PDB file of C-alpha atoms (C1' of nucleotides) in Angstrom:
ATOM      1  CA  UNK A   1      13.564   8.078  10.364  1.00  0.00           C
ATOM      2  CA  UNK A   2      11.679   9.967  12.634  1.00  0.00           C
ATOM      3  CA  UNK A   3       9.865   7.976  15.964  1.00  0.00           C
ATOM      4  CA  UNK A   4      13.453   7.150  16.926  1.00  0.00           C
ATOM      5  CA  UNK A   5      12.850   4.716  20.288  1.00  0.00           C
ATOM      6  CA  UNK A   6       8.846   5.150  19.910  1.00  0.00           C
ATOM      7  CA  UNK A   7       6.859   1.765  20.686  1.00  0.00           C
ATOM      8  CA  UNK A   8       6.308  -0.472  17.585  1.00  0.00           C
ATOM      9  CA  UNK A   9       3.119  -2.402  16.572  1.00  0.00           C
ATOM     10  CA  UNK A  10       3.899  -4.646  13.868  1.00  0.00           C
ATOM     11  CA  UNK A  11       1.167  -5.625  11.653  1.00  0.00           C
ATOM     12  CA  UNK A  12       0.407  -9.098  10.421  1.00  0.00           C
ATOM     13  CA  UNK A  13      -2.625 -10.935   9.075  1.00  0.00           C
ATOM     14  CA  UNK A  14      -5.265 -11.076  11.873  1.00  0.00           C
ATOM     15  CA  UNK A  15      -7.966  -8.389  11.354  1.00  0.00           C
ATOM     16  CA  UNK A  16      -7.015  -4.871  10.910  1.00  0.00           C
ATOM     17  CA  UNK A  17      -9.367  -4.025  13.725  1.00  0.00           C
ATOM     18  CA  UNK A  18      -6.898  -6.081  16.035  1.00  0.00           C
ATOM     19  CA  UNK A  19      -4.443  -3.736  15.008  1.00  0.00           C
ATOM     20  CA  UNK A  20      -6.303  -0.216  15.079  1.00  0.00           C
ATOM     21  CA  UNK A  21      -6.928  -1.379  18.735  1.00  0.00           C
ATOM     22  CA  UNK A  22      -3.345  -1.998  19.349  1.00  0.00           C
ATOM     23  CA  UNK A  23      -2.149   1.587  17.860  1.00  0.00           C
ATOM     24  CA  UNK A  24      -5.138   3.345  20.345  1.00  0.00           C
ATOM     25  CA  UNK A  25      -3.713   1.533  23.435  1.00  0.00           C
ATOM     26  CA  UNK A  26      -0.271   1.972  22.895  1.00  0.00           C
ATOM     27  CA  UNK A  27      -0.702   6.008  22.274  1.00  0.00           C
ATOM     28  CA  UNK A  28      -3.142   5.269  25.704  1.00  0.00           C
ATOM     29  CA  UNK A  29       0.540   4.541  27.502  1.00  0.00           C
ATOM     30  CA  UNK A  30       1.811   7.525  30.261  1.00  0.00           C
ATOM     31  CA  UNK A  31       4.246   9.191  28.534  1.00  0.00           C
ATOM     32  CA  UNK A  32       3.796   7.820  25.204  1.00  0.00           C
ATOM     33  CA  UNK A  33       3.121  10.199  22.001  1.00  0.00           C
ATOM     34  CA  UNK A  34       4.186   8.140  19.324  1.00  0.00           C
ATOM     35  CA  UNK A  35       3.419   4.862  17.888  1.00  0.00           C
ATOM     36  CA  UNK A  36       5.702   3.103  14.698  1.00  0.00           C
ATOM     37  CA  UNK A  37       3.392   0.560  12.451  1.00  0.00           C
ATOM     38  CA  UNK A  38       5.633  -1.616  10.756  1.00  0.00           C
ATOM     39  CA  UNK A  39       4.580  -3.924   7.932  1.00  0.00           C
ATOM     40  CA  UNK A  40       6.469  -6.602   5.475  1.00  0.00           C
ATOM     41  CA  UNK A  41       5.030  -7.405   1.674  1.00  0.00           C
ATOM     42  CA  UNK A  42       1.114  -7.838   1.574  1.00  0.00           C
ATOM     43  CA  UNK A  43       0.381  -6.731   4.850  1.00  0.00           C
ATOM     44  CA  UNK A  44       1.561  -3.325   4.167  1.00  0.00           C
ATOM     45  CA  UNK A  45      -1.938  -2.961   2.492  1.00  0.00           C
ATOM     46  CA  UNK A  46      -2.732  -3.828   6.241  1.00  0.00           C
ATOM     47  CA  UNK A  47      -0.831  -0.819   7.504  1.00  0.00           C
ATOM     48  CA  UNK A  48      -2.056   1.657   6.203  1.00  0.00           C
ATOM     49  CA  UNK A  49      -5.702   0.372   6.099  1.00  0.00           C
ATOM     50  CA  UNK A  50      -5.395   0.359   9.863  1.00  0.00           C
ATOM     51  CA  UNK A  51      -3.530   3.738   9.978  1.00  0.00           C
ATOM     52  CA  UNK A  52      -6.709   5.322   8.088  1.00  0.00           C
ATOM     53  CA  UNK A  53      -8.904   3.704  10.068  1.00  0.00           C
ATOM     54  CA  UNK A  54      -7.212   4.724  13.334  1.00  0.00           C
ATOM     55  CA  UNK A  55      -7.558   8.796  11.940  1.00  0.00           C
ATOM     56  CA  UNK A  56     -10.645   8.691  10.138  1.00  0.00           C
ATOM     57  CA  UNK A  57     -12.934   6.442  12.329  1.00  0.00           C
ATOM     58  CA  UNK A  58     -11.030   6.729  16.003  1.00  0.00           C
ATOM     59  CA  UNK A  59      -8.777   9.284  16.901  1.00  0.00           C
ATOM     60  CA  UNK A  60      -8.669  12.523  14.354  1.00  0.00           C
ATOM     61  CA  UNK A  61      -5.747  14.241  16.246  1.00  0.00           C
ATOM     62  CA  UNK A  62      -3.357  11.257  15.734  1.00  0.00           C
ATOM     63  CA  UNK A  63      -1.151  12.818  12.655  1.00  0.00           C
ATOM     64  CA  UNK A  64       1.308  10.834  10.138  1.00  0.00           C
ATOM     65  CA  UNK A  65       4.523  12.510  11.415  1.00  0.00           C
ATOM     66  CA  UNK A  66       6.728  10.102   8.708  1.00  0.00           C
ATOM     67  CA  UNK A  67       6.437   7.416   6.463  1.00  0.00           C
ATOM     68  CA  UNK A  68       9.202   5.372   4.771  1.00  0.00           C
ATOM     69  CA  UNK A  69       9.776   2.561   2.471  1.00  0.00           C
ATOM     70  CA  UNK A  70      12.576  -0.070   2.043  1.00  0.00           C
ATOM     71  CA  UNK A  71      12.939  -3.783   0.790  1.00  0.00           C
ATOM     72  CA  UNK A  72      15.114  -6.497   1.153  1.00  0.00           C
ATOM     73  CA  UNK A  73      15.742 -10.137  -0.542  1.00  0.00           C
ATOM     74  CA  UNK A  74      15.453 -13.526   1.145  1.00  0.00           C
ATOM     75  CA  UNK A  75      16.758 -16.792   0.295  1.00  0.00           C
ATOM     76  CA  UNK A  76      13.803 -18.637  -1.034  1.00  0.00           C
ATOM     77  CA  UNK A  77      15.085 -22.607  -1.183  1.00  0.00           C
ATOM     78  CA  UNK A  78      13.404 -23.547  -4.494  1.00  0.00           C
ATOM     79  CA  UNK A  79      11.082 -27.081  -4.082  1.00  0.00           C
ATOM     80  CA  UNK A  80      13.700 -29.346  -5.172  1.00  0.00           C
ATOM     81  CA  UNK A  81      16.286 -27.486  -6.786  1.00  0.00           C
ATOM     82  CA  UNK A  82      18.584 -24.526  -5.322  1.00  0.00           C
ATOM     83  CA  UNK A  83      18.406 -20.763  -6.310  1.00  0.00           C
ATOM     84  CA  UNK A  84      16.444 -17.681  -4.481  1.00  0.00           C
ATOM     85  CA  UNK A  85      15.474 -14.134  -5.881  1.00  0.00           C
ATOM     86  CA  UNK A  86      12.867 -12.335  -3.907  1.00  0.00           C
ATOM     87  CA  UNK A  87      12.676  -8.805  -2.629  1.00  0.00           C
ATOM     88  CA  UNK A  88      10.756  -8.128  -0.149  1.00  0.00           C
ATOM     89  CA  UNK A  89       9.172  -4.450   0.953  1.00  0.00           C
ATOM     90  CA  UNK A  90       8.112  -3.420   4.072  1.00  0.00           C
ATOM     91  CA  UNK A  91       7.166   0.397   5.341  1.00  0.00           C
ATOM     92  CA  UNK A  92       7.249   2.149   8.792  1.00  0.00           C
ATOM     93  CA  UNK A  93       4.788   4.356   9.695  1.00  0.00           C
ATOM     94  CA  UNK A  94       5.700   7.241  12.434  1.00  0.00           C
ATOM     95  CA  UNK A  95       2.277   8.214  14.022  1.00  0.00           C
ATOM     96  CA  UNK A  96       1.722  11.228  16.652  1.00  0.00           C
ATOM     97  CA  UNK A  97      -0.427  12.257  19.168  1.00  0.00           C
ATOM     98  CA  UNK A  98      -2.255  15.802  18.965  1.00  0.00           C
ATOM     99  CA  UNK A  99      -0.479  17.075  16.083  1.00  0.00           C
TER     100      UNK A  99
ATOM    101  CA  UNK B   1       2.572  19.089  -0.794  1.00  0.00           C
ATOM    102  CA  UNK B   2       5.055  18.627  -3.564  1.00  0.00           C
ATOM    103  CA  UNK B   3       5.528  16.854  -7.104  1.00  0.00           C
ATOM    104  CA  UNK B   4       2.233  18.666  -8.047  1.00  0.00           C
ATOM    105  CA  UNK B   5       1.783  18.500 -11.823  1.00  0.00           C
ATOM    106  CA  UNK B   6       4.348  15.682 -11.788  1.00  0.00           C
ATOM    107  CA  UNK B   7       3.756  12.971 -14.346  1.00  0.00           C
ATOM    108  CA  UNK B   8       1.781   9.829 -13.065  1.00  0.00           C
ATOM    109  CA  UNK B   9       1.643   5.927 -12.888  1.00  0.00           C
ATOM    110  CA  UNK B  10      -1.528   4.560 -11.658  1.00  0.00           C
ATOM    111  CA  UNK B  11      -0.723   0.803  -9.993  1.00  0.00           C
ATOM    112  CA  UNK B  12      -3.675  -1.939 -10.907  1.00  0.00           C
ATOM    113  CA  UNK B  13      -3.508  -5.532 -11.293  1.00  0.00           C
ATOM    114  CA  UNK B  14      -1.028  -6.303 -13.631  1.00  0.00           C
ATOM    115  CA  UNK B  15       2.606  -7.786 -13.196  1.00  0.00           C
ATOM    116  CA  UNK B  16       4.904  -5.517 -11.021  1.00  0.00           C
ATOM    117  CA  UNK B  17       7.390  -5.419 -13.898  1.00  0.00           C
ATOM    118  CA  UNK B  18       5.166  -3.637 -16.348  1.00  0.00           C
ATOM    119  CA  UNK B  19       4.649  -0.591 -13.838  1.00  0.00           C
ATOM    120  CA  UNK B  20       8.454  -1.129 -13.475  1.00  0.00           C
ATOM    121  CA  UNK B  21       8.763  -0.457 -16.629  1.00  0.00           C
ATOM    122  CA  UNK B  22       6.159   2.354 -17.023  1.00  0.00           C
ATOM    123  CA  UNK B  23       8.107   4.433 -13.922  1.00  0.00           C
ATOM    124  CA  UNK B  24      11.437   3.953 -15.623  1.00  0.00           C
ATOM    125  CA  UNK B  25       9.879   5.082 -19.130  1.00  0.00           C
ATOM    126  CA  UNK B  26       8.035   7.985 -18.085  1.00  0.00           C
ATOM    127  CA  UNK B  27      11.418   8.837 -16.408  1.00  0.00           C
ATOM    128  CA  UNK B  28      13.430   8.831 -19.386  1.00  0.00           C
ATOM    129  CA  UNK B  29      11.230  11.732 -20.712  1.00  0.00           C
ATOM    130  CA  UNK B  30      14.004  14.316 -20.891  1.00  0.00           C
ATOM    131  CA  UNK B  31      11.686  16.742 -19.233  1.00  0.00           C
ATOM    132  CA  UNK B  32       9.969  15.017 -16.848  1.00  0.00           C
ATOM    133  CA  UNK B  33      11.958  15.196 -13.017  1.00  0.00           C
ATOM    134  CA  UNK B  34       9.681  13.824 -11.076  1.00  0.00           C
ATOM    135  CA  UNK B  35       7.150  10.602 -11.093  1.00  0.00           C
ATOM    136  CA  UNK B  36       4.166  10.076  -8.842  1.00  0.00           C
ATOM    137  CA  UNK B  37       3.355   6.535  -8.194  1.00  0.00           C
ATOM    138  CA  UNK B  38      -0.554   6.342  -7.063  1.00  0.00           C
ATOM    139  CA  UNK B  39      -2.661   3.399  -5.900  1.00  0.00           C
ATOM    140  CA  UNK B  40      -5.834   2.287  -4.248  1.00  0.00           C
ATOM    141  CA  UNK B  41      -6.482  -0.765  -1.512  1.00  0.00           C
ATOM    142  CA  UNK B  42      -4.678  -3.802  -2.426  1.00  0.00           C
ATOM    143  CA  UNK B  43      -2.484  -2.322  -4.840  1.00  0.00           C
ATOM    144  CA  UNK B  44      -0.368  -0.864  -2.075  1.00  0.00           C
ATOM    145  CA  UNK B  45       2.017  -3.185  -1.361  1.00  0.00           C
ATOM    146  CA  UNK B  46       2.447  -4.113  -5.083  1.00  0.00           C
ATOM    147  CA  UNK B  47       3.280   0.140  -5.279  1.00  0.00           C
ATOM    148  CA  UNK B  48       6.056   0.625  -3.000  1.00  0.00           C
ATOM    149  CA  UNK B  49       7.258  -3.260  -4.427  1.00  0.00           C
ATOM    150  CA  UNK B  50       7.138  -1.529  -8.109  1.00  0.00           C
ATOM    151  CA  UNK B  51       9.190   1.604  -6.530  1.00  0.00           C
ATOM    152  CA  UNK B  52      11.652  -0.266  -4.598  1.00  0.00           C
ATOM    153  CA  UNK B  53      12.472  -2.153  -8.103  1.00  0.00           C
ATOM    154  CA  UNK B  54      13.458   0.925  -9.659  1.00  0.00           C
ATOM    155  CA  UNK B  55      15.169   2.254  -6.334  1.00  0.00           C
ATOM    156  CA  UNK B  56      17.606  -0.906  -5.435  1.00  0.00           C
ATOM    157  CA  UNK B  57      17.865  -2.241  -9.004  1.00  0.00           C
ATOM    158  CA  UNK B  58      17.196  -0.211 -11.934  1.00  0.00           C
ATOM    159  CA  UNK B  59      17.738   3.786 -11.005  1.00  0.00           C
ATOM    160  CA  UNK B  60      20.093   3.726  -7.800  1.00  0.00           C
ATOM    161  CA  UNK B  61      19.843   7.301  -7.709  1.00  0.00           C
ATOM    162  CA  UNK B  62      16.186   8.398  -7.543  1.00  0.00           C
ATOM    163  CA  UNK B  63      15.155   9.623  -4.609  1.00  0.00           C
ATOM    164  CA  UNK B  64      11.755   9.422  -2.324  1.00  0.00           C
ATOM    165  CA  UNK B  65      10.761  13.082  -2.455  1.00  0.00           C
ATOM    166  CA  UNK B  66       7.691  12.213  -0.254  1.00  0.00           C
ATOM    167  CA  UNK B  67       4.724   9.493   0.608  1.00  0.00           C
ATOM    168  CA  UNK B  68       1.292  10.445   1.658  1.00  0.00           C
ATOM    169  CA  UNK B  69      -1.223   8.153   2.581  1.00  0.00           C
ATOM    170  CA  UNK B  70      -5.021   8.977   2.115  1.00  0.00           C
ATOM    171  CA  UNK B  71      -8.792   6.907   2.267  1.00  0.00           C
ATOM    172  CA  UNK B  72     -12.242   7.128   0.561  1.00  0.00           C
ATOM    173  CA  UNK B  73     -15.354   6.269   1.273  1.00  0.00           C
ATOM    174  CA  UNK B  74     -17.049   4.235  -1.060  1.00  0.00           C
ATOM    175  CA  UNK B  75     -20.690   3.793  -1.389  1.00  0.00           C
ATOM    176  CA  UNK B  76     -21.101  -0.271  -2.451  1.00  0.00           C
ATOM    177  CA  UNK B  77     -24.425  -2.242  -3.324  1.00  0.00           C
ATOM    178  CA  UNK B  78     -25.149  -5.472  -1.654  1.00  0.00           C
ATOM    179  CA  UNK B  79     -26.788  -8.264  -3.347  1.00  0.00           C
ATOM    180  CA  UNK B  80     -29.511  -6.994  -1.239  1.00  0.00           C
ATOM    181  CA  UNK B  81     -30.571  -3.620  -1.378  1.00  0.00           C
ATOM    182  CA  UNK B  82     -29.931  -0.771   0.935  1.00  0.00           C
ATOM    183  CA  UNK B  83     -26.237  -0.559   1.296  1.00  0.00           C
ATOM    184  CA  UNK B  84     -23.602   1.381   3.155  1.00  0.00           C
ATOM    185  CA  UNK B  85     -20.256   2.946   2.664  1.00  0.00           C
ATOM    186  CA  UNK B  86     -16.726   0.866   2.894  1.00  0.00           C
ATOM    187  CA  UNK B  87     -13.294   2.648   3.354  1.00  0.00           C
ATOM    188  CA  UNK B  88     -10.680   2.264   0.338  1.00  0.00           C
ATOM    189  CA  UNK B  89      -7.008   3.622   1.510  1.00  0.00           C
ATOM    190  CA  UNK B  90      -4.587   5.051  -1.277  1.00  0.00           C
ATOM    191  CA  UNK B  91      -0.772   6.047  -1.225  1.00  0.00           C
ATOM    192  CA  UNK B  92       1.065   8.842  -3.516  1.00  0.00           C
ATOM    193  CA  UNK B  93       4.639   8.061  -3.483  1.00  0.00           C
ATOM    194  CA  UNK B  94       6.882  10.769  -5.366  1.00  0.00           C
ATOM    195  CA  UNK B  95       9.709   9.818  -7.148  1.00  0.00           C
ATOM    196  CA  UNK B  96      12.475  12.627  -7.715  1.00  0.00           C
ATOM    197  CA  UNK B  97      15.705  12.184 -10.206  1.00  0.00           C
ATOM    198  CA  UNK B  98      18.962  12.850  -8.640  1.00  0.00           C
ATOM    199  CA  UNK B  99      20.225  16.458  -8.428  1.00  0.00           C
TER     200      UNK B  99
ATOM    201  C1'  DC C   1     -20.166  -8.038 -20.582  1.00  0.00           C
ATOM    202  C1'  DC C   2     -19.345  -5.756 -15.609  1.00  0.00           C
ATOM    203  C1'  DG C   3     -18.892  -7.090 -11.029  1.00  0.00           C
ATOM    204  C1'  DG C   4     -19.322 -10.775  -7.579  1.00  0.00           C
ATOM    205  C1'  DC C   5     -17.900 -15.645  -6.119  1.00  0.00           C
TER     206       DC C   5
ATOM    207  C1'  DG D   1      -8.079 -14.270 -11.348  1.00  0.00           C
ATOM    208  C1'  DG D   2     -11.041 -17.100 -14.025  1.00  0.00           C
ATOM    209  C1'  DC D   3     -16.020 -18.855 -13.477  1.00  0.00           C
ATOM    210  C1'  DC D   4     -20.493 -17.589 -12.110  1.00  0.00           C
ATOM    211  C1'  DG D   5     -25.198 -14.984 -12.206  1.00  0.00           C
TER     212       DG D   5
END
DNA sequence: CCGGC
DNA sequence: GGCCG
């Protein structure tokens, strides 16, 4: 899990732009060369839309050092009943400056 | 740059289970040893949801070999005429059996 | 009947 | 993800 310590920019629903903005400042920080995207379920799609963006539109020498994959389940209280079985994914995305 | 000529599973818009079901049988194929899992835009999330299935509940032992993440431009036709290109993002996710 | 709504 | 054009 590389990035160890590197700032985080978690990525929700707003627009992806939001977040392709928030990547670009963050690598804009003194001393800062790396930038972890972190997304849960459907906004994963998110991630990496804004992670392509970011390289292909903004900044091409921003590189994708790691990526990883994991999932988890939550206890989902049924309407009006009692039982929960969902898994949910989420990926981390190590990006670098200047490969 | 690995799992070339690996056996594949395109993601689409079915049920998560029935590409759950497609990794696991393409992995019983006594010679296959690896499986990549490929898909396109909003099929992302439901991916890495399909692999992390088969990772935490149905083959404990496979391993991530590798992710790459990737986008294309495609050229779309408004209602209107004269239209203009849109970015799709993708993800290859390589499956290896244990060993 | 393929792609948009 | 089925109804619309």
């Amino acid at each position: 899990m590389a990035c160890e310590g590197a700032p985080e920019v978690r990525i929700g629903r707003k627009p992806v732009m939001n977040y392709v903005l928030a990547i670009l400042t963050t690598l804009m920080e003194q001393g800062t060369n790396q930038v972890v995207v972190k997304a849960r379920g459907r906004n994963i799609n998110r991630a990496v839309d804004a992670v392509e963006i970011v390289r292909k539109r903004f900044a091409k020498n921003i590189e994708i050092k790691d990526i990883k994959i994991d999932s988890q389940e939550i206890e989902v209280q049924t309407p009006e009943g009692q039982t929960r079985t969902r898994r949910v994914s989420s990926i981390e995305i190590c990006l670098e400056k200047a490969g």
